[PDB]
Design a protein around this ligand. Structure first.
Ligand SMILES: CC(=O)N[C@H]1[C@@H](OP(=O)(O)OP(=O)(O)OC[C@H]2O[C@@H](n3ccc(=O)[nH]c3=O)[C@H](O)[C@@H]2O)O[C@H](CO)[C@@H](O)[C@@H]1O[C@H](C)C(=O)O
Length: 419
């Protein structure tokens, strides 16, 4: 049971090279199930979720190898199930369903149960598949999808903006007969990425990145080489790390355009930001951040994955900051943890009201969220004394070598085993 032992405070200074987006590599790996020829996916981060996805793929009969790239050979898929033991550790596993039934006519994925973050049903995925002509049943806790022949293109309107369902439907539609239109599609950069990967394979897609995606199904998808875009959440997290430590940093291998809301918020916090084609620089000039007000919502608005990070910022900022969550209404586990470290805040429904304090004190805290829990490690870097973060296996799922990157910035951090 690994733990991080963090000794603060530290001014974070230096450079970080941004990893490929975990959230683009995932949907792309599942989408690779459609490829009839070998595929090379470049710039894939090394983290737990990629391990789980590789494991799931191998379990289907996919040939998998990795380093910076992940090589996929789905020529011999011979198993069509994603078991409970696997799905329970990573709900994103649901993405295996669409490609399976679209290409093979059959797929069975354990129905995801509860997730600590909040209510996260996959009704939209199933709805999308059915509209495509798939027959779906629930047996023994398994979602069983089937179709005799090809799926069928359809005009679908989304009851909610959904990253997951948009990917399920979009992916499955590339092999359908006819044209599919997804109305009220999610606009996330990862969706544009996945679509581009599909297009590189031979798929016909347009509108990716807009609220309206159109797919013209083809008979088969080939193979190819595709480079995954930079991780916007990793980038935001590092920018925040610098901004709350009076620091200075340059992010390499970045994609500024995927970060508008976060950059504008950092500027409001008082950060001096410059951007280039593939880089972002942030300098606090040793200043304490200014509290900001944030509202999470579908891309390009402020993302829920940067939420806890900004809550932290608000917590050591000057002034009252307010954070409202409209995606995962209960994604506030980090708050009582930070309050253990001396922070001040009240949760009213889906909103956290922050009362910035001058300094945090080191304490024992518990990670629970693969993205938001990074805020606990960030807090440890600027808190007075020693902070011990328990359950880092969560963070291991969403960040490539977070200790290494922080350490290269001056952080005093140690991975503790057992003890
Ligand atoms: C693997 C991956 O990319 N996961 C990401 C993706 O989750 P996803 O699951 O697709 O999110 P949604 O469908 O956009 O979530 C949409 C909202 O709508 C509801 N909804 C979603 C689908 C559905 O069928 N029915 C339905 O009701 C849902 O409850 C949520 O409130 O998008 C989230 C928001 O950006 C991210 O926080 C999440 O990252 C996480 C941390 C991670 O890296 O593990």
């Amino acid at each position: 049971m690994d733990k991080f032992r963090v000794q603060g405070p530290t001014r974070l200074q230096g450079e970080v090279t941004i990893s490929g987006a975990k959230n683009a590599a995932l949907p792309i790996l599942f989408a690779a199930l459609l490829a009839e020829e070998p595929v090379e996916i470049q710039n894939v981060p090394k983290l737990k979720d990629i391990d789980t996805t590789m494991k799931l793929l191998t379990q289907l009969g996919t040939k998998v190898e990795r380093x910076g790239s992940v090589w996929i050979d789905a020529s011999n898929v011979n198993n069509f199930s994603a078991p409970y033991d696997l799905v329970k550790t990573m709900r994103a596993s649901i993405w295996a369903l669409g490609p399976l039934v679209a290409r093979f006519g059959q797929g069975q994925v354990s129905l995801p149960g509860g997730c600590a973050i909040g209510a996260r049903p996959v009704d939209l995925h199933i709805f999308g598949l059915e509209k495509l002509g798939a027959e779906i049943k629930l047996e023994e806790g398994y979602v069983k999808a089937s179709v005799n022949g090809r799926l069928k293109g359809a005009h679908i309107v989304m009851d909610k903006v959904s990253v997951g369902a948009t990917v399920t439907i979009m992916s499955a539609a590339t092999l359908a007969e006819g044209t599919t239109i997804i109305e009220n599609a999610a606009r996330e950069p990862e969706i544009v990425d996945t679509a581009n990967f599909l297009v590189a394979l031979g798929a016909k897609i347009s509108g990716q990145g807009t609220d309206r995606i159109t797919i013209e199904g083809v008979e088969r998808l080939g193979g190819g080489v595709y480079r995954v875009l930079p991780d916007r959440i990793e980038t935001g997290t590092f920018l925040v790390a610098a901004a709350i430590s009076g620091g200075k940093i340059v992010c390499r291998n970045a994609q500024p355009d995927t970060l508008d809301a976060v950059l504008a918020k950092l500027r409001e916090a008082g950060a001096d930001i410059e951007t280039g084609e593939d880089w972002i620089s942030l300098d606090m000039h040793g200043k304490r951040p200014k509290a900001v007000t944030v509202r999470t919502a579908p891309h390009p608005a402020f993302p829920t994955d940067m939420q806890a990070q900004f809550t932290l910022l608000n917590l050591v900022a000057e002034g009252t900051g307010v954070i409202t969550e409209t995606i995962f209404e209960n994604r506030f586990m980090h708050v009582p943890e930070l309050i253990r470290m001396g922070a001040h805040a009240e949760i009213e429904s889906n909103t956290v009201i922050c009362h910035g304090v001058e300094k945090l004190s080191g304490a024992q805290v518990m990670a629970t969220d693969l993205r938001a829990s990074a805020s606990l490690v960030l807090a440890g870097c600027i808190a007075e004394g020693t902070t011990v973060v328990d359950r880092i296996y969560h963070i291991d799922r969403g960040y490539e070598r977070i200790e290494d990157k922080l350490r290269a910035l001056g952080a005093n951090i140690e991975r503790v085993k057992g003890e």
